[PDB]
Amino acid sequence: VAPTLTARLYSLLFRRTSTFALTIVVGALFFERAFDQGADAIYEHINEGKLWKHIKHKYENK
Amino acid sequence: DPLTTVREQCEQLEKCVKARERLELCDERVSSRSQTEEDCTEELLDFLHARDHCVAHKLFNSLK
Amino acid sequence: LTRFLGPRYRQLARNWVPTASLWGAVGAVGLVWATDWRLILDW
Amino acid sequence: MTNIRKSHPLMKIVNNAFIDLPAPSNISSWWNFGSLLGICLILQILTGLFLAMHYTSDTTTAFSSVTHICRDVNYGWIIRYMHANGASMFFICLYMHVGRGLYYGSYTFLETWNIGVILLLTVMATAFMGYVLPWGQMSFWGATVITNLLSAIPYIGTNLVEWIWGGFSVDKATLTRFFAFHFILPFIIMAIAMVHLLFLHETGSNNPTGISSDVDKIPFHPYYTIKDILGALLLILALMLLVLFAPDLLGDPDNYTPANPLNTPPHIKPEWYFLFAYAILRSIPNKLGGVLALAFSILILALIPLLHTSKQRSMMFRPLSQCLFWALVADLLTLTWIGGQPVEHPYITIGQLASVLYFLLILVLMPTAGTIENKLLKW
Amino acid sequence: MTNIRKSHPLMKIVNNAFIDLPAPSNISSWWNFGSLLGICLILQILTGLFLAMHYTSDTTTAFSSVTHICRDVNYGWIIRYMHANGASMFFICLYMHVGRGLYYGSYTF
Amino acid sequence: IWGGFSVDKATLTRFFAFHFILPFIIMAIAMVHLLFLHETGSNNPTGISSDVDK
Amino acid sequence: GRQFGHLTRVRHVITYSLSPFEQRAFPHYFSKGIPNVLRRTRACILRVAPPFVAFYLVYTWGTQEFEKSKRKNPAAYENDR
Amino acid sequence: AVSASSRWLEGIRKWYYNAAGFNKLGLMRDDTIHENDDVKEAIRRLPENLYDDRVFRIKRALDLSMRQQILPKEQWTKYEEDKSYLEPYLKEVIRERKEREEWAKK
Amino acid sequence: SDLELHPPSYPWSHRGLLSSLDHTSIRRGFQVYKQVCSSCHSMDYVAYRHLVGVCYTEDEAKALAEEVEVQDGPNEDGEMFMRPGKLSDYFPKPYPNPEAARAANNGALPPDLSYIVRARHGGEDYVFSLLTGYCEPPTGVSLREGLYFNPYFPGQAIGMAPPIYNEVLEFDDGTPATMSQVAKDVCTFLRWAAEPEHDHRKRMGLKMLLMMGLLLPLVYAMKRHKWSVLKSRKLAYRPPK
Amino acid sequence: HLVGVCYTEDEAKALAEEVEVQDGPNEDGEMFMRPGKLSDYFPKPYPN
Amino acid sequence: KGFSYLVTATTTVGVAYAAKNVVSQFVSSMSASADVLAMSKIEIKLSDIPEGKNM
Amino acid sequence: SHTDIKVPDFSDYRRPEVLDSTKSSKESSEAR
Ligand code: HEC
């Protein structure tokens, strides 16, 4: 036997609220980045070449 | 160039044909009885609508 | 509404009118300074 | 006690109205509008103060100023469109609030009801002046025609409309006044809100059943802090959905046109919150008759306590009022519609019967229905 | 209790911090600065709201605006100078307030 | 704070907004001040409790 | 005063509760919702929906007329005559 | 002269109760009243049985409301069983106070 | 009291929640405004800040903004020594001041296009169906020369010269300049110009939509757990005796 | 000045008329402005 | 007793006169300005427009 | 008294991990 993923997570990070909070701070960080990355990608995909990011070429450095 | 073709097409559909008959009688009724207060504008206002609904959807795929 | 109305109450109303009556006069005086009616000024 | 943080500071005890307070168990989702109500008051304020961090209150500039907030200033666009849209929400929320009070008889709390009413009307003033700050064609005219609608009063009116405006028209003088009162109302209103809360804390929150819950009471902290946070979450959702996807949708007015005093949008009308008020004025031929009836629209609220006829403060058990409650709401929707309508036959005749329906529903129908239901229950 | 206006409304009870409250007997004139301090805040406020009823906040105008408040507007001159002078008072009063609790140990609170 | 490299419009509107809203925030603090002070009453010249003479 | 020890007086009632960590927060939600949602909506619909329905008719008719009377520029009185 | 109309009303009354939430809830009609100063005193006048009953009923009721659950069809308050138990108590309280007013008036 | 015709929900790249602005359209459109439209209508809140918005480089728009200050330059603004260079300058006012503007167009006053798509009720649809909508006056109707008949003007008559006509201008790439094709590009530059924040907002909205949805789901679950105990609890009355 | 300077309203009107005839609103931007007005402020020595 | 009441009454009258003036001054500034009110009632123009139009 | 009456079953409400009477609460508790 081993602790369910949650039980593992629990005893390592959620017993102590100091840890818990630390987690959340960390998480908030990591999460913001992934979300953005993913969620920006997703949104740019839906407008391929519609956005200046796609279109800079034409008049850039000759 | 683009706009002008699509418009025509749109008025070639059975519902555009059908409601243009009101325009045709309008115009003649009014022109012949010219003193009347009858507005031919009002009659045109139905045609235009149906022409334009159509125009929009098609007209768009042709521009840049 | 109905409960408030009473045969007994009249003395209070009479008393109130004077105090109320006196109070009413003050407003006219108070309003008048702000209002500045030429006619009021003439009075 | 020792080191019970809460009652140690006396101040921090006063905050235990949030955490420790008796809150009924049963409680529709409707009550989250109180809290959200505050939410909106705080959001407008933070937003307002930043916009009023880059806004100018002159004829010349005001339009420009707003225009500049939405263009050159960093994240000024959302702040402004968040502020505009918010106020919609603020009102959408307000009218849920009063619905609930109407329906479950929360208005029994007369003193709380009377503050509410003041609240409602104060915000109403706020919203009317803010919309004029940007000084655009809709704003410009809307102020004239509302303000002037005050000149109906026979003896004074006329003089008085001219004092409010600071002159004969609505030039700079008026424009800076609204800027100042818009700014200071919300602060005054917060005091009111808290005063409102004060009174309500003395008898706690009514329920859908309509009976005391003292026999069922729950921790506000444990339960109602998450509910409220959740409420937010949906509230914000709506505010950003609006603000991000359809910024102008709910802001009927398309008049982004700098106000030209000879020019007129033949279709002059207040916003959605004030749409009902404009409609009420229209059904009466006479000016003065329309102003009285406009005031009575809103001011009729404070009567309802006295109108209450049933033995069940809860409409929940009285079908018939649940039907006329809904109708009033749908009559209210009907009236809002008229507001954006040409003032012509079709709409006139409709509005007029809706304005009678509204006052019947409130003054005469409901009260009778109350009685009836009481008599069918043998009460 | 019945018909004791004060405690009837809960709100009106809250206001009996003015009327019924225990107040020390002996009490220098210095204390009057607390109250006065609050008169000053109210004064400033009403004044401000009337000044900000005819002021503009732009480079171009501001100056003019104030200048217009003191010339063409009716009784705006005193309102503005009352405003300016007020704030001096507001401070004169504040520094009496602090002196009194620096002296008498009010800062014990 | 300045909303730019100098003190131009930017800064002057900001002051107008903050000046207008600080005294309204201040009023709540004054009332919070009075709140606390109503829990122990006002001191005196003598420096001694006056509960015996109130 | 004190809001928790002073609310009311309750004799002879037992309550039994469980801890969050022992239970599930989503109790056959689809299954309860459908039947509960269904059962209250159907007891609401009759009391609520009507007036809205009404407004819709009035909206519909009310707009038709307008467009007619105004687009029917000849509506009031005919042309030929 | 009420034989047919009142008869319809009697049938209507059952429907009204059925229409009313309290019957559906299972709580008594008397219990539902807006707790004001007269109800309050009546309330206080209740025997332990009557009165503890009204506490459980409302307990069970606000519990349901909190969970948006309706009671089973088998366990509902039937109109034919209209315990108007507050009515008796509530009447007097009013009766007393109406008098009080009469004595006060004259 | 004349019926007003209303604009189609014309197929736009951006009609959709996530859809965004097509800069090439913007670009094109721009020129249209600048050649077709700068003559009588102004755009005051628009600076020469297309850069990233319009994919015109900084050097590109600097240059584009330089010639506009060389010909229309700050001599019309009040800068006596002004010539080419500057980028803070806003699009050049067709005329000194409004009153003029009405004289040039005989009583009428060319509306600032800055906000026109947003400004006119009915958005870019109306703007497109106005320009592209020009039909023959209706039997028995009279028209003062200025009063051209347009199927979509409130009062059923507008003081507008040939807004746009085939081959009015020419675009760099080679986009077929049809009356309509150009209108599709002109509107778009207006929509982008009218609501600069909105273009950014749609992208933000997508991010906001996902976060709000995720947050809402957790809260319902988080909310349920805290309130679970009251809901889970069943209280059974116990008889006194 | 009227009351402030004891110049009448006719007196100052006149006094203010000639100043608008010579320095007039042509220095302010009122192309076709001449004698008459009283809301005009003292004439700026130079354009700017 | 009458003297005491009279003294209190006298103080109120002095305050009221000041109060009326002070209150009036605050109200007066808000209601109108001699900026605006300079232009009010003062208007003339003629003979510069067509024998036909409307300005 | 309290001893006479059995608490109402929470098996439906109770989580599957903690559902079994035989299963130890402590093992389930860490996971729960
Ligand atoms: C030749 C000068 C001229 C040009 C070029 C021109 N307009 Fe106009 N436009 C006018 C005038 C004059 C009016 C006023 C119409 C009226 O008041 O009847 C007008 C009116 C409008 C309106 C009507 C809005 C309303 O309801 O009042 C729109 C929309 C508009 N212009 C947009 C445009 C756009 C977009 C372009 C370029 C693609 C353009 N205009 C080009 C002169 C011009």
Ligand code: HEM
């Ligand atoms: C609920 C109270 C308030 C409501 C209902 C409200 C509503 C409004 C509305 C409807 C507008 C018009 C915006 C537009 O459509 O362009 C507006 C503008 C404005 N408001 Fe608010 N507002 C409130 C509070 C405030 C506060 C507290 C401030 C300052 C701290 C403020 C400052 C402004 C400013 C400067 C503008 C002008 C620029 C603009 O149009 O954004 N408002 N307000």
Ligand code: HEM
């Ligand atoms: C500035 C606007 C307002 C705010 C921020 C606000 C806020 C709140 C909140 C947070 C609550 C508690 C929850 C609830 O019952 O929904 C509440 C309750 C209440 N409000 Fe408001 N409110 C406002 C306007 C009003 C108005 C205009 C009135 C009536 C005229 C009013 C009357 C009431 C009443 C009677 C209750 C108690 C109902 C009950 O639970 O029995 N409110 N308010």
Ligand code: HEM
């Ligand atoms: C906006 C400014 C202020 C207002 C409106 C205000 C108001 C008041 C009032 C009304 C009282 C009661 C009467 C009195 O003792 O004079 C008081 C007392 C007091 N205030 Fe202030 N206050 C202000 C600023 C301050 C400052 C700047 C301090 C010190 C840092 C302060 C500290 C105190 C203390 C310690 C007392 C109690 C002294 C005693 O009575 O034994 N206050 N305040």
